[PDB]
Amino acid sequence: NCTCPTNKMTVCSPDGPGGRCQCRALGSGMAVDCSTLTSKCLLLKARMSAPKNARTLVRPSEHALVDNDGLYDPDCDPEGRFKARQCNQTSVCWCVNSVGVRRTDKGDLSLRCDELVRTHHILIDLRHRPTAGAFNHSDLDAELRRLFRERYRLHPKFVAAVHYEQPTIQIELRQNTSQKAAGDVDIGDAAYYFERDIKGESLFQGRGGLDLRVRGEPLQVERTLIYYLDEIPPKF
C-alpha cells in the first residue's frame, strides 16, 4: 500500500519498476525517506507549495499578509537542509540557521552567507489548559522523553531536560554538530514535527494531532513557544 507514514505531505503511487511504490515530496518534488523525519525545509516548501493550477481557486496577494511573518518558501540544498541564504523576495536576502529562522539583517542580492549556522539548543515552552491541579513531574518527564524517543525517533541523549511547574512546561533539546552521527534525526526536525503535532497539523499519515496523555489524564496545550539557540550569535 503506497503510503509515506512519516510525511503525509507527499505524493506516492505504484508507478515503479514492477509496480514499485514511488513517492516524492509535495511542492519541492524532492525525495523523501518515509522511514524517518523529512527535513523541515522540504516540509516548509510543501506547506506553501503554490497549487499547480488553481482553476477555480484564488491566489494570495502582493499585499495580503499572514499571522506568522516567519512563514515563507525556502530553497533547500541537495541534502534536504536549508541553504545558508534565503532570498524569497525581489532583491531582499538574509542568512538563516539550520532551523530556518533569520540570523542577519535583510540585505540585497550581493549577500554572502558562508556557513549554515547550526541551531544546537532548542527550548520548547508549552502551557496547557489548567486542570484541577498539577501532574507529577516524573510522569511528565517520562511521557515527553518517550514521545521524542519513539514518535519523532529522536535519540534519548538529545533531550537535555524537562522542567515542570504550575501549567507552564519546558523542554530542552541539545545537539551539537560534533555529537550528530550518520542518520540521526535533527532536533530542528523533531521540534518542527512536535510543534506541528501540538498545533493539530501533524505530518504523520494516520494521526491528526497529538494525544499527549500523562498517566490517564490528557494534556491539551493552549500556548507554545519555541526558542532556537545557535552556536554563533546572530548579527543584528
Query: Contact positions toward ligand NAG, by CB under 6 A?
Result: 48, 66, 71-73, 88-90
71 binds, among a copy of itself, ligand NAG, none (CB under 5 to 8 A by kind): ligand NAG
Min dist. Cβ of residue 50 to ligand NAG (A): 7
106 vs 137, beta carbon nearer a copy of itself: 106
35 vs 179, beta carbon nearer a copy of itself: 35
Min dist. Cβ of residue 99 to ligand NAG (A): 17
The Cα 213–Cα 55 span in angstroms is 43
CA angle 94, 95, 96 (to 5 degrees): 125
73 binds, among a copy of itself, ligand NAG, none (CB under 5 to 8 A by kind): ligand NAG
Residues within the interface to a copy of itself (CB under 8 A): 3-6, 15-17, 20-25, 27-36, 45, 78-80, 109
Q: What amino acid occupies position 153?
A: R
What is the pairing mode between strands 213-214 and 217-218? Answer: antiparallel
27 binds, among ligand NAG, a copy of itself, none (CB under 5 to 8 A by kind): a copy of itself
The Cα 41–Cα 231 span in angstroms is 20
Query: Grid coordinates standing for 153?
Result: 525517533
Task: Give the neighbor-by-neighbor strand order of the sheet with 159-164.
Answer: 159-164, 168-174, 119-128, 221-230
